[PDB]
């Protein structure tokens, strides 16, 4: 059936990510920003199926955006939950993706270097939008996206960071620079370490929710 | 069915539009380059009712591209055969739209100064695209649309004229503003007067004949 | 000298847009997020002064985009500080704006249409930018921009609204709805009435006060 | 002093790259396209130096497509006759260039596989623009810029393709294919060596006349 999504729970509570990520964004971030986004593509597939059958090619051009923003939105978000976990995880330590910081270390030349690049790539995105670690052909890439715009280029994207300000704002106010180096302490390496070694169908199967 | 669209044939024969266009350059435009859009459109459609039918987000978002780009290349050319006529047809005199060329007139003040007006607009695009006159819920308005991105936002498209490096540079090399010039003798008013007087979906009914 | 800017002080005390605005946001708008503009775009102009004595034109190039983000968001905020009002203020009164009313209604048929074709806009910004009402030579027109792009394509901007989630989301969270129908207390039409009579050079002056 | 560029003569006569490029488009191209681009940038410095010392931040950012626009354009084909020779010279042979083969080859599997990967990025490039094969960190990429956009960001490129229609419609009329096939007769593989192991401040030298 076209347009049966639904919001997927949470690999986690609402308070398991502080003192990195408040409660209350996380239960914002989820239950609001998120639930709007599938929400959004439902209707939109729908209204693109009508356009469909009918050949109307002005309707499915003019309802691109829509279909872009929010389906994008639910795969960014989608892929945001699994790959965090609270800190005292033991997903959380990089020690849980050998083969993955080993491609690290030989590209950046070392993990730390890397958090290094990682970091200056999300605070120098200009409004809203994220930042990923992808996996092409070879080796890796550290790429942005603006808004909701999604990874389905053919790459294999490992983890992405939200930069929105919906995303800190509530917690860490315009310092998105002291939310950038707390979100380390949640990544969950092991989530990292499996999509790195699968292939692009194997990332987007998190989608079945 | 699904991706479905044939290339409709020209309203004259390929020499009709000389000497302002040469015959050469309007059948390459149109059997060629219109039949590429025609041809990738119904392709890409096609692929995109295996992925909607499938729930593949995806793959639905990755086809955007191309359907966009060939689907706005069949509008803007289709949109084009039809608002061009020879310059000894009735249809490129101006007296043919008494209406359009009265508004024209009180926007720009007269119409010479709104041919003033878009011939900078065209001479000004950056690399490829088109030039368009359309009705908005103000007035009339000109708009550029880059590569092959159609005026599909609700505005009711006049007429348009492609800035493609195809469309003249066999004739008039990269003398863009010759093939300006000589462009407005063959402006089909009468179809400019109809868009004119009509909705959205009255002019968007050229597309019928692509089936 | 190049890149000489400051932060101009606000027309009122951080709480005088309450409760439409909360003086907490109004503050970190201000003294926060405008000065990193401000502060950010004399080091751009900075480097560009020694990249253009140079003729270093790939330096020139590279640094477009911190001195269109930053240059643009200083423009945005310094016209945002002087287009609003406390409500209690006699700015704030539709009824001070004669001629802007009377254009306006001529336009979208009241003024109670046209709010309901700005929020429209506004709600309807996909990631951060901003909402502005322009004229042009054609009457009025609601444009949207996108992050701190600015309005200096020629048309003088009568007032804006900022989208961004940093100007409501302390205070109504995800609400962006309850921020727009709230600011509507706060549109100071005085500054709206004078932009609207002068031109481009006119309403710019308001960026000579951050020497 | 602001805005004194001039055009560059070419390191070959206008009929060297026949019958891969016919010598009516290298005359156009050069004499007529990239001359506009060089003078339209002068005046762009001129005005922008003006509005730079009145600190008219508007004019500033106005002018910034014309200066994107014309100055990339110049960059760009100064870049493309350097790295175009006649088929019959040396530096046509892959052969001249053999520690950028041996990076190809660890890339793309085969200076075969390349060809097809860049040629395939040609072709789908929509509207006017360019194709580049550029020099990040470590490896090699093929990228695609729109219009005239160089290559600005800090990459080392090694060689780009012209696939605007003004470069290949008088001979190939609407078929590029031949056109990227043909072109592979003509480049420069020394050229593409030497700005493969020289930096970024090595390759922008070109940029001197
Ligand atoms: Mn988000
Ligand atoms: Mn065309
Ligand atoms: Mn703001
Ligand atoms: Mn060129």
């Not at 939109?44 to 955006?65: E, F, G, M, R």
């Not at 892929?79 to 690290?104: H, R, V």
Request: proline letters at 5%; a negative charge.
């Amino acid at each position: 059936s076209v347009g049966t999504f639904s919001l997927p729970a949470l690999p986690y509570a609402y308070d398991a990510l502080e003192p990195s990520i408040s409660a209350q964004i996380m239960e914002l971030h989820h239950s609001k920003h998120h639930q709007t986004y599938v929400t959004n593509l439902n209707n939109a597939l729908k209204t693109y199926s009508t356009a469909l059958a009918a050949n109307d090619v002005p309707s499915q051009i003019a309802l691109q955006a829509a279909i872009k923003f929010n389906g994008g939105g639910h795969i960014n978000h989608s892929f945001f939950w699994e790959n965090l976990c609270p800190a005292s995880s033991p997903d959380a330590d990089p020690a849980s993706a050998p083969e993955l910081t080993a491609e690290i270390a030989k590209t950046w030349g070392s993990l730390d270097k890397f958090k290094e690049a990682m970091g200056k790539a999300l605070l120098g995105i200009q409004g809203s939008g994220w930042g990923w670690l992808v996996k092409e052909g070879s080796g890796l890439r550290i790429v942005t996206t603006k808004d909701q715009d999604p990874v389905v280029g053919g790459e294999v994207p490992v983890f992405g960071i939200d930069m929105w300000e919906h995303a800190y704002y509530l917690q860490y106010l315009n310092g998105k620079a002291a939310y950038v180096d707390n979100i380390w302490k949640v990544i969950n390496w092991k989530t990292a370490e499996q999509r790195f070694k699968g292939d692009r169908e194997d990332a987007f199967k998190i989608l079945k929710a």
